[PDB]
Subunit: 424 residues, 3 copies
């Protein structure tokens, strides 16, 4: 009988009855009660905290012998060749309507431009807008990209690749060491290219964005700028972040895009919009790369624009937490940039360039742009979200907290359970 | 007797005397001594570390369906209408003296401007500087704010609110989704507004600062800029930080401002200066919003400037740690910004704007400013300071460290104490 | 006999044989085996994790009553006085060759400039390039530094110190409170200074870099810029980072530079290059401060440039991890900066400055530069790499994990070992 109380190896209270004294027995019983009470309260609290799925983050800065230079893409803030637009003004509103897929900016209904564009779309059903923008848009050529070098190696227009964005033709670089970097000298040729000011496209200069090669450029007002007549120096540093899965973080690794190119939030949004629009129309706008047939011009007014309006009005596409349609990615790469400027044509260099290009000194100040992109002296930086706890970690805390007061362990718990099993 | 050594549940050494052997008894005594010696040393060390009140910080990045756009405020780098200042030059030095409350920049004594300003203040005692600056300062009007939109919705001058700063009249916006943001097109009208160059106000352009709506703008050289004739794109991302109380961090939540608008370091400085000045003079400079009566002009020279000089000399107002007069706030919101530029009037748009405003092409280049502020694609970032330890955490470590060597617990400590109590 | 099993204070299973029952004995043996099996597996795992030398990083933001303003250095983007270069064009290629030590940019062999420079070097062996660049380079003077102030105190050209960089003469400031800072107004005098455009030096403006006073400026494309005719405002905040030693982090504190000025990565690279070159030639290029004799001009072509080519081609000098020749420093200071601009000469101030300097209005727009550098409202930020574990920490985890299941301690391990020793 007494062996049950005397043999239970938990520190507990062996002398509850073996003390053979009233005061000692009462004290021992009180201790036995209180120790386990505190232990169970603490363990309940600890389990409650665990069920919150806590996390912690860490910051580290690595460096490598050599590193990948992120891809860059460029576009001209004047989107159309002047002659092709001189007698064809409706093109502005046509392109605006077609680009609503990306820029998501509402058009005043029954506006003169909208009315004329609708009339033209009703008339010239077989007209090909995409071919027009490809042929008559911006273009890279010895007459446009005067100079360009990369880590001391010359590069040629053939090295770039074509891309479509709301600004028309856009060109990427490096598509799929400190100090050194990419250097360029554009000739925006402001007299040859033009744009509608009434639509707000008033500024002149080069708009470019930095992105990882796997990505598709975004722009939509997030791209950087560079003015005419000033040499702009841009310094960048790679930044990488990691997120934990939804139970702890917000990523959902299991989702995959129809292109199957891993995953990317903007790609998820594009695919979602393509999927939605395909239901309401048998064709997909070509600005979304390869989801199906390109719609005839009239379909843009007939179905596309109302569909986008409805999508935004009902928030059928969203990003952010796992509850959103396109949750955050497991891994992401950002390239923060800082900028500084210098007057590009110096008086001494101005005449030299004028002789080189057989053009007036006014033209040089009013047309040329020089850009330089370099890695900073500190190469790399990473942010990582840690799993604050797993099953083992909680058990480690459980044992220490349990042993703190009661001076017990799982073996003692098993022994106590064995004693209970006989009584039950 | 022997039950005391045999029954003490602490692992220790039960066989100190029960071993019935010299070597075993000596070994057991040595073990019993050494285990507790190491345990007590470790526990003392750990208590010492705890009394340092350690802390750790974490970084996280959240996102929401929609977010609040921070308030923005603007001012003109030319502060006074040209005609009102043409025959009234003393106004420059008068305003400088009055603004010493904010800009805290010393004035060379007995300077011609200072002498003339003192003479005028002695003469025109009843002159109202504040009314003058309100009436003749900068102003928002269809002639000044040519265009402005907010998330695609047009906005009108009536949407702004008036504010006083060292630059005279200043206007706020949004006072108390990615890509989209605020767009503006100012007409600085450099011919109509003017400023004293001898005082250093040589540059022309728009100066603005970004702050949470609850806050009061600061400027004092911390505001951003935007030049004339260039379209400036500004991208921002909300950053939030939290600090622990003085025993761990530096915050002192218990301090409350007389306006009772929660707390803010700059507000604390303003209130402290108002309190100090009110003692030495029955009136408070109006640039401090609502602490009492506004002082007559002469009082600025009589008391205010010497009082400010004394304040700075004796450091009667300070910020930073809890020892400072205005300690750091518990919660803070900052909006870091990056900037890039483009030439604003394009050759094609230049003529259009000239026709629109019936003004020369030179005027357009020399007067207009265009600004755009957008949220970045990543919305939110927060920094939080964690309590590295509370009472429970130290106890958890205490039990594990104690159990490591001696294999004991609080229950054993109680049992050991009970044995000691009988002997005592 | 039975005392061995009954007396072993480890919770384990005292009743393996004392149970006097088959089922109880089997259960107790199973428990004794399983508890220690799990414990040993967990302890092995934990030792494995420890041997990874884990680390964690923390971020904190402190503030002080006053703080040290970092040193700044400036250079002119036009490097040579126009007259001295008018009839001496070979100087451009000569300086390019000599500066190859720093800019590490390859020269096209047998180029006309290279041929003529080699001819001159063969002819004028005793010509002193360093004296030439010192005398005829950029210079600070009342004719060049029109104005400059520091925290409200006027400063004079005598306060700067001379330095040599690839841009020729360069001047430092502050060499070995919020809002207030450094203000300057340069006169680049674009007519008096000039540079070769064919070498790419086309832009005009001021190039400057921010560094701690102990450091030597780097430039090499990492320096900031500021254009002509625009007032540039620069805001900075001090950032400090701390790294752990190679076993945990990447620092190797034991390495010391020959100058013994503590340590710095760029200093390590400079010293390494000097050491390598000194072997292949008895003289060291003067751009490396004080490592020995300066080489005669011909030696630059004879030995230096081939030696640099070989160094780069064999990566004999490297930075980064401890495996690299110049590992990361233990402590580093960076000064990230953000920039904004305003049109410098306002119409009202333009005439005033023209009268002040007796120069045409065109000159003022085409020659003057204004800069201002200020500390942000948040002073200081530090990043620290923590030792995730020491010997004591692992022992703390070891005891808790051991006590979790087996309910044992080192004392029990000693008792078990004592029992084993007798059997052995």
């Amino acid at each position: 009988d007494h062996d049950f109380a005397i043999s239970t190896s938990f520190h507990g209270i062996h002398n509850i009855v073996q003390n053979r004294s009233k005061i000692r027995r009462v004290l021992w019983l009180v201790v036995v009660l209180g120790s386990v009470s505190l232990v169970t309260w603490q363990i309940y609290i600890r389990l409650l905290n665990y069920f919150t799925w806590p996390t912690t983050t860490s910051i580290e800065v690595q460096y490598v012998e050599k590193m990948e230079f992120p891809a860059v893409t460029f576009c001209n803030l004047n989107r159309f060749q002047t002659d092709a637009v001189a007698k064809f003004g409706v093109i502005f509103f046509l392109w605006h309507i077609v680009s609503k897929v990306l820029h998501l900016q509402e058009i005043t209904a029954n506006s003169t431009g909208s009315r004329e564009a609708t009339d033209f779309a009703a008339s010239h059903q077989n007209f090909s807008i995409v071919e027009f923008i490809r042929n008559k848009g911006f273009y890279l050529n010895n007459s446009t990209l005067l100079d360009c070098e990369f880590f001391g190696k010359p590069c040629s227009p053939k090295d770039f690749a074509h891309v479509f964005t709301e600004y028309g033709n856009c060109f990427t670089f490096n598509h799929g060491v400190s100090g050194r970097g990419l250097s360029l000298l554009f000739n925006v040729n402001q007299e040859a290219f033009t744009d509608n000011p009434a639509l707000g496209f008033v500024d002149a200069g080069i708009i470019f964005v930095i992105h990882s090669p796997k990505k598709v450029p975004q722009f939509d007002g997030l791209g950087l700028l560079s003015p005419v007549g000033m040499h702009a120096r841009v310094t960048i540093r790679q930044v990488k972040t990691v997120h934990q899965e939804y139970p702890w973080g917000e990523c959902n690794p299991n989702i995959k895009l129809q292109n199957f190119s891993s995953y990317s939030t903007s790609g998820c949004l594009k695919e979602c919009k393509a999927q939605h629009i395909k239901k309401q129309c048998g064709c997909v706008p070509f600005l979304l790369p390869g989801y199906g047939i390109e719609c005839d011009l009239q379909k843009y007014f007939s179905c596309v624009s109302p569909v986008l309006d409805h999508i935004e009005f009902k928030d059928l596409c969203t990003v952010g937490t796992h509850n959103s349609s396109c949750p955050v990615s497991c891994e992401e790469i950002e390239y923060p940039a800082t900028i500084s400027y210098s007057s590009f044509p110096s008086q001494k260099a101005l005449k030299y360039l004028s002789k080189k290009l057989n053009q007036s000194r006014k033209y040089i100040r009013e047309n040329l742009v020089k850009i330089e992109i370099n890695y900073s002296d500190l190469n790399y930086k990473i942010t990582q979200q840690q799993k604050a706890v797993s099953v083992s970690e909680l058990l480690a805390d459980l044992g220490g907290q349990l042993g703190l007061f009661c001076g017990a362990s799982l073996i003692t718990i098993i022994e106590i359970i064995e004693y209970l099993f006989t009584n039950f």
